[PDB]
Enzyme design. Sequence first.
Site, PDB file in Angstrom:
ATOM      1  N   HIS A 150       0.891  -1.155   0.000  1.00 57.79           N
ATOM      2  CA  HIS A 150       0.000   0.000   0.000  1.00 57.79           C
ATOM      3  C   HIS A 150       0.937   1.214   0.000  1.00 57.79           C
ATOM      4  O   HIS A 150       1.588   1.493   1.008  1.00 57.79           O
ATOM      5  CB  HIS A 150      -0.844   0.011   1.274  1.00 57.79           C
ATOM      6  CG  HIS A 150      -1.926   1.037   1.260  1.00 57.79           C
ATOM      7  ND1 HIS A 150      -3.197   0.762   0.814  1.00 57.79           N
ATOM      8  CD2 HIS A 150      -1.913   2.351   1.582  1.00 57.79           C
ATOM      9  CE1 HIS A 150      -3.925   1.863   0.861  1.00 57.79           C
ATOM     10  NE2 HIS A 150      -3.171   2.842   1.322  1.00 57.79           N
ATOM     11  N   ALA A 151       1.006   1.911  -1.132  1.00 52.13           N
ATOM     12  CA  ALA A 151       1.888   3.060  -1.306  1.00 52.13           C
ATOM     13  C   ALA A 151       1.966   3.921  -0.070  1.00 52.13           C
ATOM     14  O   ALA A 151       0.970   4.114   0.620  1.00 52.13           O
ATOM     15  CB  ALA A 151       1.428   3.902  -2.499  1.00 52.13           C
TER      16      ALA A 151
ATOM     17  N   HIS B 215       1.027  12.106  -5.113  1.00 47.96           N
ATOM     18  CA  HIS B 215       0.498  12.178  -3.749  1.00 47.96           C
ATOM     19  C   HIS B 215       1.655  11.914  -2.776  1.00 47.96           C
ATOM     20  O   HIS B 215       1.958  12.738  -1.915  1.00 47.96           O
ATOM     21  CB  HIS B 215      -0.595  11.126  -3.529  1.00 47.96           C
ATOM     22  CG  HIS B 215      -1.244  11.209  -2.184  1.00 47.96           C
ATOM     23  ND1 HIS B 215      -2.375  11.961  -1.948  1.00 47.96           N
ATOM     24  CD2 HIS B 215      -0.892  10.676  -0.989  1.00 47.96           C
ATOM     25  CE1 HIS B 215      -2.688  11.892  -0.667  1.00 47.96           C
ATOM     26  NE2 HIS B 215      -1.802  11.120  -0.062  1.00 47.96           N
ATOM     27  N   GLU B 216       2.313  10.768  -2.931  1.00 49.08           N
ATOM     28  CA  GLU B 216       3.410  10.429  -2.034  1.00 49.08           C
ATOM     29  C   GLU B 216       4.520  11.486  -2.025  1.00 49.08           C
ATOM     30  O   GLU B 216       5.019  11.853  -0.947  1.00 49.08           O
ATOM     31  CB  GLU B 216       3.970   9.056  -2.400  1.00 49.08           C
ATOM     32  CG  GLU B 216       2.933   7.936  -2.322  1.00 49.08           C
ATOM     33  CD  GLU B 216       2.297   7.779  -0.933  1.00 49.08           C
ATOM     34  OE1 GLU B 216       2.962   8.107   0.082  1.00 49.08           O
ATOM     35  OE2 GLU B 216       1.138   7.302  -0.853  1.00 49.08           O
TER      36      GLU B 216
ATOM     37  N   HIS C  40       4.105  14.194   0.316  1.00 44.87           N
ATOM     38  CA  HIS C  40       4.588  13.932   1.659  1.00 44.87           C
ATOM     39  C   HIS C  40       6.089  14.183   1.757  1.00 44.87           C
ATOM     40  O   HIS C  40       6.561  14.830   2.696  1.00 44.87           O
ATOM     41  CB  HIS C  40       4.286  12.486   2.056  1.00 44.87           C
ATOM     42  CG  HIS C  40       2.824  12.187   2.200  1.00 44.87           C
ATOM     43  ND1 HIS C  40       1.992  12.935   3.004  1.00 44.87           N
ATOM     44  CD2 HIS C  40       2.073  11.163   1.725  1.00 44.87           C
ATOM     45  CE1 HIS C  40       0.794  12.377   3.028  1.00 44.87           C
ATOM     46  NE2 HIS C  40       0.817  11.299   2.265  1.00 44.87           N
TER      47      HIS C  40
ATOM     48  N   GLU D 204      -1.792  15.446   3.563  1.00 40.65           N
ATOM     49  CA  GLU D 204      -2.422  14.701   2.480  1.00 40.65           C
ATOM     50  C   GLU D 204      -2.737  15.519   1.230  1.00 40.65           C
ATOM     51  O   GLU D 204      -2.863  14.961   0.144  1.00 40.65           O
ATOM     52  CB  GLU D 204      -3.729  14.062   2.959  1.00 40.65           C
ATOM     53  CG  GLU D 204      -3.588  12.982   4.028  1.00 40.65           C
ATOM     54  CD  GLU D 204      -2.469  11.995   3.739  1.00 40.65           C
ATOM     55  OE1 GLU D 204      -2.128  11.777   2.559  1.00 40.65           O
ATOM     56  OE2 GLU D 204      -1.939  11.421   4.702  1.00 40.65           O
TER      57      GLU D 204
ATOM     58  N   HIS E  50      -6.630   1.160   5.807  1.00 36.71           N
ATOM     59  CA  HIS E  50      -6.550   2.062   6.958  1.00 36.71           C
ATOM     60  C   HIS E  50      -7.222   1.580   8.238  1.00 36.71           C
ATOM     61  O   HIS E  50      -6.777   1.939   9.328  1.00 36.71           O
ATOM     62  CB  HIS E  50      -7.104   3.439   6.592  1.00 36.71           C
ATOM     63  CG  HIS E  50      -6.474   4.029   5.375  1.00 36.71           C
ATOM     64  ND1 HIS E  50      -6.639   3.482   4.119  1.00 36.71           N
ATOM     65  CD2 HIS E  50      -5.642   5.085   5.220  1.00 36.71           C
ATOM     66  CE1 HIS E  50      -5.932   4.177   3.245  1.00 36.71           C
ATOM     67  NE2 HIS E  50      -5.318   5.153   3.886  1.00 36.71           N
TER      68      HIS E  50
ATOM     69  N   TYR F 245      -8.146  12.621   5.027  1.00 34.22           N
ATOM     70  CA  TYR F 245      -8.423  12.627   3.596  1.00 34.22           C
ATOM     71  C   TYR F 245      -9.624  13.496   3.256  1.00 34.22           C
ATOM     72  O   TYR F 245      -9.688  14.112   2.178  1.00 34.22           O
ATOM     73  CB  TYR F 245      -8.660  11.193   3.119  1.00 34.22           C
ATOM     74  CG  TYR F 245      -7.491  10.304   3.441  1.00 34.22           C
ATOM     75  CD1 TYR F 245      -6.288  10.435   2.754  1.00 34.22           C
ATOM     76  CD2 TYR F 245      -7.564   9.374   4.479  1.00 34.22           C
ATOM     77  CE1 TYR F 245      -5.177   9.662   3.088  1.00 34.22           C
ATOM     78  CE2 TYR F 245      -6.462   8.603   4.828  1.00 34.22           C
ATOM     79  CZ  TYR F 245      -5.268   8.753   4.125  1.00 34.22           C
ATOM     80  OH  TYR F 245      -4.172   8.006   4.478  1.00 34.22           O
TER      81      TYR F 245
HETATM   82  N1  LIG Z   1      -4.787   2.467  -4.244  1.00 36.76           N
HETATM   83  C1  LIG Z   1      -3.620   3.193  -3.638  1.00 36.76           C
HETATM   84  C2  LIG Z   1      -4.032   4.382  -2.945  1.00 36.76           C
HETATM   85  C3  LIG Z   1      -2.783   5.303  -2.519  1.00 36.76           C
HETATM   86  C4  LIG Z   1      -2.174   4.997  -1.234  1.00 36.76           C
HETATM   87  C5  LIG Z   1      -2.239   5.998  -0.115  1.00 36.76           C
HETATM   88  N2  LIG Z   1      -1.461   5.565   1.100  1.00 36.76           N
HETATM   89  C6  LIG Z   1      -1.501   6.338   2.416  1.00 36.76           C
HETATM   90  C7  LIG Z   1      -0.589   5.603   3.454  1.00 36.76           C
HETATM   91  C8  LIG Z   1      -0.552   6.254   4.826  1.00 36.76           C
HETATM   92  C9  LIG Z   1       0.307   5.578   5.859  1.00 36.76           C
HETATM   93  C10 LIG Z   1       1.108   4.444   5.507  1.00 36.76           C
HETATM   94  C11 LIG Z   1       1.925   3.810   6.486  1.00 36.76           C
HETATM   95  C12 LIG Z   1       1.944   4.302   7.827  1.00 36.76           C
HETATM   96  C13 LIG Z   1       1.142   5.432   8.182  1.00 36.76           C
HETATM   97  C14 LIG Z   1       0.331   6.061   7.200  1.00 36.76           C
HETATM   98  C15 LIG Z   1      -1.053   7.778   2.136  1.00 36.76           C
HETATM   99  O1  LIG Z   1      -1.828   8.709   2.493  1.00 36.76           O
HETATM  100  O2  LIG Z   1       0.020   7.991   1.557  1.00 36.76           O
HETATM  101  C16 LIG Z   1      -3.725   6.104   0.363  1.00 36.76           C
HETATM  102  O3  LIG Z   1      -4.148   5.290   1.244  1.00 36.76           O
HETATM  103  N3  LIG Z   1      -4.557   7.033  -0.149  1.00 36.76           N
HETATM  104  C17 LIG Z   1      -4.263   8.069  -1.172  1.00 36.76           C
HETATM  105  C18 LIG Z   1      -5.552   8.778  -1.326  1.00 36.76           C
HETATM  106  C19 LIG Z   1      -6.543   8.282  -0.529  1.00 36.76           C
HETATM  107  C20 LIG Z   1      -5.994   7.114   0.307  1.00 36.76           C
HETATM  108  C21 LIG Z   1      -6.797   5.845  -0.009  1.00 36.76           C
HETATM  109  O4  LIG Z   1      -6.633   5.211  -0.999  1.00 36.76           O
HETATM  110  O5  LIG Z   1      -7.607   5.566   0.942  1.00 36.76           O
HETATM  111 ZN   LIG Z   2      -0.990  10.371   1.958  1.00 32.39          ZN
END
Ligand SMILES: NCCCC[C@H](N[C@@H](CCc1ccccc1)C(=O)O)C(=O)N1CCC[C@H]1C(=O)O
Ligand SMILES: [Zn+2]
Length: 598
Positions: A315-316, A345-346, A349, A373, A475, A485
């Site tokens: 999970h990115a 997005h990343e 951060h 975010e 999450h 978000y």
């Molecule tokens: N289909 C891939 C989605 C992109 C991944 C992104 N990742 C999250 C990961 C947050 C996190 C990871 C590890 C420890 C603590 C916090 C992010 O906001 O980067 C995300 O969850 N996002 C990005 C936008 C919305 C949210 C989601 O999808 O619910």
């Molecule tokens: Zn994020």
Amino acid sequence: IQAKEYLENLNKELAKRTNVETEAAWAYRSAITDENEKKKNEISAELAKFMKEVASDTTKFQWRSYQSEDLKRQFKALTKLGYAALPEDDYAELLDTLSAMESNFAKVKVCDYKDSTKCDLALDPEIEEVISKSRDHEELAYYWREFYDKAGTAVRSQFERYVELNTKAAKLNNFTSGAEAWLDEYEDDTFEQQLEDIFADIRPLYQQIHGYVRFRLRKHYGDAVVSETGPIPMHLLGNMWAQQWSEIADIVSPFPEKPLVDVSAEMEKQAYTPLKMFQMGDDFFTSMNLTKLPQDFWDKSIIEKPTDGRDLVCHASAWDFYLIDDVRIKQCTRVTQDQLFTVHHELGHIQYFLQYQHQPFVYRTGANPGFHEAVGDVLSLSVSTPKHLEKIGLLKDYVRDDEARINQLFLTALDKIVFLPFAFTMDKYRWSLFRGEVDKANWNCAFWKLRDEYSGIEPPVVRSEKDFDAPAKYHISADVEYLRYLVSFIIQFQFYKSACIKAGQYDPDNVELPLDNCDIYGSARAGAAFHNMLSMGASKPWPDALEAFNGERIMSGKAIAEYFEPLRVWLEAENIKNNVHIGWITSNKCVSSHHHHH
Ligand SMILES: NCCCC[C@H](N[C@@H](CCc1ccccc1)C(=O)O)C(=O)N1CCC[C@H]1C(=O)O
Ligand SMILES: [Zn+2]
């Protein structure tokens, strides 16, 4: 007396120690092994004892009566122990149950629908693709059911104890529950209501997209599959959680005959690679006079899914190692437009990390979780415009027709507007548990009732209290606050609007300069605004951070509704022209069992 010298010394130690903790978190989440899991929690357990011992020391400094507020800001923050206030035994148990859910999520594997022999399909690549491309409702249902039973249900037991420990931890810190503790991060006793008020304003727009999407789907899949006036069968919305619908734009777009920005194919035919994608992202930032990615980022990042058979978390996500320039991203990137947005997005951060690196450890976090975010999303909005995509050649020939502009706004409405109520329910749900408002016997239905109430969505098949679905969402399993978000999708348009104005891209009065088409790429004045805001890193409550950006101090919707306005006027008309039903009756998908065998 001066505790400033104390705080300085302390933050520097906390950073050094968090660095160690971060490396173990990184190793585990890069290679899931019982060993790495053990070290990981082991480190956290140690750091937790240090904090307790640092919490009792602050009793020495009577900051609650100090002069220079900044020191007084740091103490209030450092003494606010989280899960760490918890006693040793509990904290360790929390770490475990937390690990149990996390690893459970990442280890999900299901058998292919057309080959009961494979059984090695995981969420990130395989299943994620099926839900995106398949148009066989029974097949999408299969994958939905298979995934939810493994990722959600299998962990109800741990989740419940997590809630209990989360609540215990909160009270130890003088909070009513974990719900108020999360809200504390926005430092505003009226934050939830503000969010309730903005949602109320956009909801009508949300109920002109919902009915329209339910319209086409029922036209495409047929009456027996999609009923009018009933909640939309999630799983036909192209996303496992139905949090964004752009994936089904091919069967649901206003003008199928007109172009639908789908840069995926061109990226692929053009030999695009993850590395190329990250470099593009990097260029966007520097072109704004923002910070270039450091050398550690390229050496230490994992931008493509490991080729070995190891288990990891894909999970990115982006990581701050709390040193100077040691920042890394871990993403199982694929060449598609969506992944390209994720890449930005990343980096949002990462940029934020570099921008506030020089700040005292305690202030090395975002001003308000929502701000962290939104950064990357602001660039993604620019990158998504026909203007910017044509400039980089990922859109060979395109004409702004008019009834083609709708295919761009509406397409964006499947990601940005549709998401709002989804994100709101994720935390409204966890809040209701954190607050002891729901009975354990109604835990799974409280979830779907909320998904039904706010999103007009329901499971493809009947679930009961025997099942437990909230954990199926990354999450929920990873204990990552979600309201962040919802604030982002709101405030990012405020950032974007202003940035576009500071650039010569957006003029309310002049046509040919519409909001939905500014690129801000290469904008030094937008980069400057971003720099003023980002460099502050939590050193001040968020209204001051925002004020640094554009002089405003309030969270509002004077952007999305000014962005999607032309889209909104097009729907109200189109919906009437097709006599499209708006609103939906309550769902019958949550029950408590029934069988045809004896
Ligand atoms: N289909 C891939 C989605 C992109 C991944 C992104 N990742 C999250 C990961 C947050 C996190 C990871 C590890 C420890 C603590 C916090 C992010 O906001 O980067 C995300 O969850 N996002 C990005 C936008 C919305 C949210 C989601 O999808 O619910
Ligand atoms: Zn994020």
